[PDB]
Coordinates of C-alpha atoms in Angstrom, one line a residue:
Chain A
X117 CA -0.3 -0.1 -0.1
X118 CA 1.9 2.8 -1.2
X119 CA 1.1 6.4 -2.0
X120 CA 2.8 9.1 -4.0
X121 CA 2.3 13.1 -3.0
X122 CA 3.2 15.9 -4.5
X123 CA 3.0 19.8 -4.4
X124 CA 3.6 22.7 -5.9
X125 CA 3.3 26.2 -5.4
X126 CA 2.1 29.1 -8.1
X127 CA 4.6 31.3 -6.4
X128 CA 7.7 31.2 -3.5
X129 CA 8.2 35.0 -2.8
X130 CA 5.6 37.2 -0.8
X131 CA 6.4 40.5 0.4
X132 CA 5.8 41.6 3.4
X133 CA 2.5 42.7 3.1
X134 CA 1.6 38.9 2.8
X135 CA -0.6 37.6 0.1
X136 CA -2.2 34.6 -1.8
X137 CA -0.2 31.5 -2.9
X138 CA -2.3 29.0 -4.9
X139 CA -1.2 25.2 -4.6
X140 CA -1.5 22.1 -6.7
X141 CA -2.1 19.0 -4.4
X142 CA -1.2 15.4 -6.0
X143 CA -1.8 12.3 -4.8
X144 CA -1.7 8.8 -6.7
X145 CA -2.3 5.6 -5.2
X146 CA 0.3 3.2 -7.0
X147 CA -1.0 0.4 -5.2
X148 CA -2.9 -2.4 -6.4
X149 CA -5.6 -2.9 -3.9
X150 CA -7.6 0.2 -3.1
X151 CA -6.3 2.5 -0.6
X152 CA -8.4 4.6 2.1
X153 CA -6.4 7.8 3.5
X154 CA -6.7 11.0 5.3
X155 CA -4.8 13.9 4.1
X156 CA -4.3 17.6 5.1
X157 CA -2.2 20.7 3.7
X158 CA -0.3 22.6 6.8
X159 CA 2.0 25.2 7.0
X160 CA 4.9 25.5 9.5
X161 CA 6.5 29.0 9.8
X162 CA 9.1 31.1 11.9
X163 CA 8.5 31.8 15.6
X164 CA 6.7 28.4 16.4
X165 CA 4.0 29.3 13.6
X166 CA 2.0 26.3 12.9
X167 CA -1.1 26.6 11.1
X168 CA -3.6 24.5 8.5
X169 CA -3.8 26.2 5.3
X170 CA -7.6 25.6 5.1
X171 CA -9.7 28.8 6.5
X172 CA -13.3 28.4 7.4
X173 CA -15.9 32.0 7.9
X174 CA -17.7 30.0 10.4
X175 CA -17.3 28.1 12.9
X176 CA -14.9 25.0 12.2
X177 CA -16.9 22.4 13.6
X178 CA -15.5 19.2 10.9
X179 CA -13.6 16.3 11.8
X180 CA -10.4 14.7 9.7
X181 CA -12.8 12.8 6.8
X182 CA -11.1 10.1 5.1
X183 CA -10.8 9.8 1.5
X184 CA -10.3 7.0 -1.0
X185 CA -8.5 6.2 -4.6
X186 CA -8.9 3.5 -6.9
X187 CA -6.0 1.3 -8.1
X188 CA -3.6 3.0 -9.7
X189 CA -5.7 6.4 -9.9
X190 CA -4.5 9.8 -8.9
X191 CA -6.5 12.6 -6.8
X192 CA -5.8 16.1 -8.2
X193 CA -6.6 19.1 -6.0
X194 CA -5.8 22.6 -6.5
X195 CA -5.6 24.4 -3.1
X196 CA -5.2 28.1 -2.2
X197 CA -4.6 29.8 1.0
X198 CA -3.9 33.3 2.2
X199 CA -0.9 34.2 4.0
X200 CA -1.9 37.6 5.8
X201 CA 0.2 40.6 6.7
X202 CA 0.4 40.1 10.2
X203 CA 2.4 36.7 10.1
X204 CA 5.9 36.9 10.7
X205 CA 8.3 37.6 7.9
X206 CA 10.9 34.7 7.2
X207 CA 10.7 30.8 5.5
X208 CA 7.8 29.1 5.8
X209 CA 7.0 25.2 4.8
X210 CA 4.0 24.3 3.2
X211 CA 3.3 20.4 3.5
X212 CA 0.8 18.5 1.7
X213 CA 0.4 15.2 4.4
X214 CA -1.2 12.1 3.6
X215 CA -1.7 9.1 6.2
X216 CA -2.8 6.1 4.7
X217 CA -5.3 3.7 6.9
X218 CA -2.4 1.3 7.6
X219 CA -0.3 4.0 9.2
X220 CA 2.0 4.9 6.5
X221 CA 2.9 8.6 6.4
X222 CA 3.8 10.4 3.0
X223 CA 4.5 13.7 2.9
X224 CA 5.6 16.7 -0.2
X225 CA 7.0 19.8 1.2
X226 CA 7.1 23.1 -0.8
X227 CA 9.0 26.4 0.8
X228 CA 8.3 30.0 0.3
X229 CA 9.2 33.1 2.1
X230 CA 7.9 36.2 3.2
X231 CA 9.2 39.6 3.8
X232 CA 12.8 38.3 2.7
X233 CA 14.6 36.6 -0.3
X234 CA 14.0 32.9 -1.5
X235 CA 17.6 32.5 -2.1
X236 CA 18.8 34.4 1.2
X237 CA 20.2 33.6 4.2
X238 CA 18.9 34.3 7.5
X239 CA 20.4 37.1 8.8
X240 CA 20.6 39.2 12.0
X241 CA 20.8 42.8 10.3
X242 CA 23.7 42.2 8.7
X243 CA 25.4 39.2 10.2
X244 CA 24.5 36.0 8.6
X245 CA 23.6 32.5 9.6
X246 CA 24.8 29.6 7.3
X247 CA 24.1 26.2 8.6
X248 CA 24.4 23.2 6.2
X249 CA 24.1 19.4 6.3
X250 CA 27.8 19.0 5.1
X251 CA 27.3 15.9 2.5
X252 CA 23.9 15.4 2.3
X253 CA 23.1 12.9 4.4
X254 CA 19.4 12.5 4.9
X255 CA 18.8 9.3 7.1
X256 CA 20.7 6.9 9.1
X257 CA 20.3 3.3 10.2
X258 CA 18.5 2.0 12.8
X259 CA 22.4 0.9 14.4
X260 CA 23.4 4.5 14.2
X261 CA 25.2 7.3 12.3
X262 CA 27.1 10.5 12.2
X263 CA 25.9 13.6 10.1
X264 CA 28.4 16.6 10.4
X265 CA 26.8 20.1 9.5
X266 CA 29.0 23.0 8.7
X267 CA 28.4 26.4 10.9
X268 CA 29.0 29.7 9.6
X269 CA 28.4 33.2 11.3
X270 CA 29.7 35.8 9.3
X271 CA 29.6 39.3 10.8
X272 CA 28.9 41.7 7.9
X273 CA 28.4 44.6 10.0
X274 CA 30.5 47.4 10.8
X275 CA 30.3 47.0 14.4
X276 CA 31.0 44.1 16.6
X277 CA 28.0 41.7 16.9
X278 CA 27.2 40.0 20.3
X279 CA 25.5 36.5 19.8
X280 CA 24.5 33.7 21.7
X281 CA 24.3 30.6 19.5
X282 CA 23.2 27.1 19.7
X283 CA 21.6 23.6 18.4
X284 CA 19.2 21.2 19.0
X285 CA 17.6 17.9 17.4
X286 CA 14.3 18.1 18.1
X287 CA 12.8 14.2 17.4
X288 CA 10.5 11.5 18.5
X289 CA 8.7 10.8 21.8
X290 CA 9.2 14.6 22.8
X291 CA 12.9 14.7 22.6
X292 CA 14.7 17.8 22.0
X293 CA 18.5 16.5 22.0
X294 CA 21.9 19.0 22.4
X295 CA 23.5 19.0 19.2
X296 CA 25.5 22.5 20.2
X297 CA 25.6 23.7 24.0
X298 CA 25.1 27.8 24.1
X299 CA 27.8 29.5 23.1
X300 CA 28.5 33.5 23.8
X301 CA 30.5 35.2 20.9
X302 CA 32.1 38.6 20.2
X303 CA 32.5 38.5 16.6
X304 CA 34.0 41.8 15.4
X305 CA 33.6 43.5 11.9
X306 CA 33.9 41.3 9.2
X307 CA 35.0 38.4 10.7
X308 CA 33.4 34.4 11.0
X309 CA 32.8 31.9 13.9
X310 CA 33.2 28.9 11.6
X311 CA 33.3 25.3 12.2
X312 CA 32.0 21.9 11.9
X313 CA 29.6 20.3 14.5
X314 CA 28.4 16.7 14.4
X315 CA 25.8 14.8 15.8
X316 CA 25.9 11.1 16.5
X317 CA 23.0 9.3 16.5
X318 CA 23.3 6.5 18.8
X319 CA 22.3 3.3 18.1
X320 CA 19.7 3.7 21.1
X321 CA 18.0 6.8 19.7
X322 CA 14.6 5.9 18.7
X323 CA 13.5 5.6 15.0
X324 CA 11.8 8.6 13.4
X325 CA 12.3 12.0 12.3
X326 CA 15.0 14.5 13.9
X327 CA 14.5 17.9 12.8
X328 CA 18.1 19.8 13.3
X329 CA 17.7 23.3 14.3
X330 CA 19.9 26.1 15.0
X331 CA 19.4 29.4 16.3
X332 CA 21.1 32.6 16.9
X333 CA 20.1 35.4 19.1
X334 CA 21.7 38.7 18.9
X335 CA 22.0 39.7 22.7
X336 CA 21.6 43.4 22.0
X337 CA 19.0 43.9 19.6
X338 CA 17.0 40.4 21.0
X339 CA 16.3 39.6 17.1
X340 CA 16.5 35.9 17.1
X341 CA 16.8 33.9 13.9
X342 CA 16.9 29.9 13.0
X343 CA 17.7 27.4 10.3
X344 CA 16.7 23.9 10.0
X345 CA 17.5 20.8 8.7
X346 CA 15.9 17.1 8.6
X347 CA 17.6 14.1 9.5
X348 CA 15.5 10.7 9.8
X349 CA 16.5 7.7 11.8
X350 CA 15.3 4.2 10.3
Chain B
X212 CA 13.8 0.6 33.4
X213 CA 15.0 3.8 34.2
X214 CA 13.0 6.4 37.0
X215 CA 13.4 10.3 36.4
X216 CA 13.1 13.1 38.2
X217 CA 13.4 16.7 38.1
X218 CA 12.8 19.5 40.3
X219 CA 13.5 23.2 39.9
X220 CA 14.8 25.7 42.9
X221 CA 13.1 28.8 40.8
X222 CA 9.7 28.8 39.1
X223 CA 9.2 32.2 38.4
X224 CA 11.7 34.6 36.3
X225 CA 11.3 38.4 35.5
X226 CA 11.5 39.9 32.3
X227 CA 15.5 40.5 33.0
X228 CA 15.9 36.9 33.0
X229 CA 17.7 35.0 35.8
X230 CA 19.1 31.6 36.9
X231 CA 17.6 28.5 37.8
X232 CA 19.1 25.6 39.6
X233 CA 17.9 22.3 39.1
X234 CA 17.9 18.9 40.7
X235 CA 18.1 16.0 38.7
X236 CA 17.4 12.2 39.8
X237 CA 17.8 9.6 37.7
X238 CA 17.4 5.9 39.4
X239 CA 18.1 2.5 38.0
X240 CA 14.7 0.2 39.0
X241 CA 15.9 -2.9 37.0
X242 CA 18.0 -6.1 38.2
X243 CA 20.4 -6.0 35.6
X244 CA 22.8 -2.9 35.2
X245 CA 22.1 -0.4 32.9
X246 CA 23.6 1.9 30.5
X247 CA 21.9 5.2 28.9
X248 CA 22.3 9.0 28.0
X249 CA 20.8 11.8 29.1
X250 CA 20.6 15.8 29.1
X251 CA 18.8 18.3 30.3
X252 CA 16.7 20.9 27.7
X253 CA 14.4 23.7 27.4
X254 CA 11.6 24.9 25.1
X255 CA 10.0 27.9 25.3
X256 CA 7.7 30.4 23.3
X257 CA 8.1 31.5 19.6
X258 CA 9.4 28.0 18.6
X259 CA 12.7 28.5 21.4
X260 CA 14.4 25.3 21.6
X261 CA 17.7 25.3 23.8
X262 CA 19.8 23.0 25.8
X263 CA 20.1 23.9 29.3
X264 CA 23.9 23.5 29.3
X265 CA 26.4 26.0 28.2
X266 CA 29.8 26.7 27.5
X267 CA 31.9 29.5 27.3
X268 CA 34.4 28.3 24.5
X269 CA 34.0 26.1 21.5
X270 CA 31.3 23.2 22.3
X271 CA 33.3 20.2 21.2
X272 CA 31.8 17.6 23.4
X273 CA 29.9 14.3 22.2
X274 CA 26.8 13.0 24.2
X275 CA 28.6 10.5 26.4
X276 CA 26.9 7.0 28.0
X277 CA 26.5 6.6 31.8
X278 CA 25.8 3.7 33.5
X279 CA 23.9 2.9 37.1
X280 CA 24.2 -0.6 39.1
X281 CA 21.2 -2.5 39.9
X282 CA 18.7 -0.3 42.4
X283 CA 21.2 2.7 42.0
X284 CA 20.3 5.8 41.6
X285 CA 22.3 8.9 39.7
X286 CA 21.9 12.4 41.6
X287 CA 23.2 15.6 39.5
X288 CA 22.9 19.6 40.7
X289 CA 22.7 21.6 37.1
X290 CA 21.7 25.1 36.6
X291 CA 21.2 27.4 33.8
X292 CA 20.9 31.0 33.0
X293 CA 17.7 32.4 31.0
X294 CA 19.2 35.6 29.8
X295 CA 17.2 38.7 29.5
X296 CA 17.2 39.0 25.8
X297 CA 15.0 35.5 25.9
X298 CA 11.1 35.8 24.9
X299 CA 9.1 36.4 28.0
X300 CA 6.3 33.5 28.2
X301 CA 5.9 30.2 29.4
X302 CA 8.8 27.7 29.3
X303 CA 9.3 23.9 29.7
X304 CA 12.3 22.1 31.0
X305 CA 13.0 18.4 30.2
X306 CA 15.0 15.7 31.7
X307 CA 15.7 13.4 29.3
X308 CA 17.0 9.9 29.6
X309 CA 17.5 7.7 26.5
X310 CA 18.5 3.8 27.9
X311 CA 20.7 1.7 25.7
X312 CA 17.7 -0.3 24.9
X313 CA 15.8 2.4 23.0
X314 CA 13.5 3.2 25.8
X315 CA 12.9 6.8 26.4
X316 CA 11.9 8.5 29.9
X317 CA 11.4 12.4 31.0
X318 CA 10.6 14.5 33.8
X319 CA 9.4 17.9 33.1
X320 CA 8.9 21.0 34.9
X321 CA 7.5 24.4 34.1
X322 CA 8.4 28.2 34.7
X323 CA 7.5 31.2 33.3
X324 CA 9.6 34.7 32.4
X325 CA 7.7 37.9 32.6
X326 CA 4.3 36.5 33.4
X327 CA 2.9 35.2 36.3
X328 CA 3.1 30.9 36.8
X329 CA -0.2 29.2 35.6
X330 CA -1.6 32.7 34.3
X331 CA -3.5 32.7 31.2
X332 CA -1.8 33.7 27.7
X333 CA -3.4 37.2 26.8
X334 CA -3.3 39.4 24.0
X335 CA -3.6 42.8 26.3
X336 CA -6.9 42.5 27.9
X337 CA -8.2 39.6 25.5
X338 CA -7.5 36.5 27.9
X339 CA -7.3 32.8 25.8
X340 CA -8.2 29.7 27.8
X341 CA -7.8 26.4 26.3
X342 CA -8.0 23.1 28.4
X343 CA -7.5 19.5 28.1
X344 CA -11.3 19.4 29.2
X345 CA -11.1 15.9 31.2
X346 CA -7.7 15.6 32.0
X347 CA -7.1 12.7 29.1
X348 CA -3.4 12.9 28.7
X349 CA -3.0 9.9 26.3
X350 CA -5.3 7.4 23.8
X351 CA -4.6 3.7 23.2
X352 CA -3.3 2.3 19.8
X353 CA -6.7 1.9 18.7
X354 CA -7.4 5.3 18.7
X355 CA -9.5 7.9 20.7
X356 CA -11.0 11.2 21.2
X357 CA -9.8 14.2 23.6
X358 CA -12.1 17.2 23.6
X359 CA -10.6 21.0 24.6
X360 CA -12.6 24.0 26.1
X361 CA -11.8 27.0 24.1
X362 CA -12.4 30.1 25.9
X363 CA -11.6 33.6 24.3
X364 CA -12.6 36.4 26.8
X365 CA -12.5 40.2 25.9
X366 CA -11.7 41.7 29.1
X367 CA -11.0 45.0 27.0
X368 CA -12.9 48.0 26.8
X369 CA -13.2 47.9 22.9
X370 CA -14.0 45.2 20.1
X371 CA -11.2 42.8 19.7
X372 CA -10.3 41.4 16.0
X373 CA -8.6 37.9 16.3
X374 CA -7.4 35.4 14.2
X375 CA -7.8 31.8 15.7
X376 CA -6.6 28.1 15.1
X377 CA -5.1 24.6 16.4
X378 CA -3.1 22.1 15.2
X379 CA -1.7 18.6 16.6
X380 CA 2.1 18.5 16.0
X381 CA 3.0 15.1 16.2
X382 CA 5.3 12.0 14.7
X383 CA 6.7 11.6 11.4
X384 CA 6.8 15.8 11.1
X385 CA 2.8 15.4 11.1
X386 CA 1.2 18.5 11.4
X387 CA -2.4 17.7 12.0
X388 CA -5.3 20.4 11.7
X389 CA -7.3 20.4 14.8
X390 CA -9.2 23.6 14.1
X391 CA -9.0 25.5 10.6
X392 CA -8.4 29.4 10.6
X393 CA -11.0 31.5 12.0
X394 CA -11.8 35.4 12.0
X395 CA -13.6 36.7 14.8
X396 CA -15.1 40.3 16.2
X397 CA -15.3 39.8 19.6
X398 CA -17.3 42.7 21.4
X399 CA -16.4 44.5 24.5
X400 CA -16.7 41.8 27.6
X401 CA -18.2 39.4 25.2
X402 CA -16.8 35.8 25.0
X403 CA -15.9 33.1 22.3
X404 CA -16.5 29.7 24.0
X405 CA -16.5 26.4 22.4
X406 CA -15.7 22.8 22.6
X407 CA -13.6 21.5 19.9
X408 CA -12.2 17.7 20.0
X409 CA -9.6 15.9 18.2
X410 CA -10.3 12.2 16.9
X411 CA -7.0 10.4 17.4
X412 CA -7.5 7.6 14.6
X413 CA -6.4 4.1 15.1
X414 CA -4.4 4.6 11.9
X415 CA -2.3 7.4 13.3
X416 CA 0.9 6.8 14.5
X417 CA 2.4 5.9 18.0
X418 CA 4.0 8.7 20.0
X419 CA 3.8 12.5 21.1
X420 CA 1.1 14.9 20.1
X421 CA 1.4 18.2 20.8
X422 CA -1.7 19.8 20.7
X423 CA -1.2 23.7 19.6
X424 CA -3.6 26.5 19.8
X425 CA -2.9 30.0 18.6
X426 CA -4.7 33.4 18.6
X427 CA -3.5 36.6 16.5
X428 CA -4.8 39.8 17.4
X429 CA -5.2 41.4 13.7
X430 CA -4.3 44.8 14.5
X431 CA -1.4 45.0 17.1
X432 CA -0.2 41.5 15.5
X433 CA 0.5 40.0 18.7
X434 CA 0.5 36.3 18.9
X435 CA 0.0 34.0 21.5
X436 CA 0.2 30.3 21.8
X437 CA -1.1 27.7 24.1
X438 CA -0.1 24.0 24.3
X439 CA -1.1 20.4 25.5
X440 CA 0.7 17.3 25.2
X441 CA -1.3 14.1 24.3
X442 CA 0.5 10.6 23.9
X443 CA -0.7 8.0 21.2
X444 CA 0.3 4.8 23.1

């Protein structure tokens, strides 16, 4: 019982004043028997924003209904959503999510930005943050694995920058795993805090999805900025 | 297998932040000797997640394993700073133990910063009251229904314009709609009051679901959150 899910956005790039985004959802039953499943469209944004794409004028009373697909058949839906002005500027993730009757989870994600450039590194006002999965390693075995991350904090400002920086891995069973302890830094003008920092996914760590999350706070302004990568333990 | 506790010397920090000293207890209740890894992590508002542990230099350490004799208990004092620049609001401290066999054990305490302990989140007179109606903290693998009471009380002298929604953030990257995005004009002294439940379908994966409600003031742009945790066995 395998489902194939895709998602595409008619646009990636919203200005600060927000806007409308029209999406195209594709759900294909690649299996031989007929398949029942639930699906929905959800948005995840900065500052712990999580919201459903779906909006209603009245009182939301609906429960999550099941759907179905004929053998080899595909569902095709257009779905649009507003992203209002009052929502935080930053990087957003739209997620088509399918839960099949058998427990298997399938997803398709697209990103968009609001009030910043699609290509751009997160920044604290000249101080740019560059965190990357160094070797494109997107999973580790049940028996364990090591994934290294490159960390580059570049002070583009004309003055010194005072920052606190840390990393966690948010994962199953409510786990928040320290990846990098809280570090305080004075970074001089034009200078760079640059290093490699890895996480060892111990054999004993539970199977599932780990969200590798890095944060940087400007100690003076109080602006906080994030970057995230996903690693799955099989 | 493992018994974990956590207590805080302080629950209540002012806006200018402060220091919190914690006491970690880890007890091996098992008959054989047990190996495990453990750590201390903080979760706050606005998607804040940070490790309790801080270093002045370059963090270079790896997550070391520990061990406990049969019936033996580990006892550690561990403190952490919560600086002024961190967001005001409700925080969760979490002692987390991962045993060599895969079993996860936790002990959580809450604290607040710049607001009263157990106070209702508010958007400036507009108070938000979301509660697990019947104290149901888990559902069986075969499924279950958990209802939530929702009370949005406009204490202001003028009308309040809000947008409101709910999700359940859970395993395998799932963000499950619990309440669609609703726009509301709430008159002075009035209440948006209702019950809203989530059906944890048999098919939903085992694990930890974070029931999350958010309210935005459309005029000010202030956003406020309330969260409750439900585990599917």
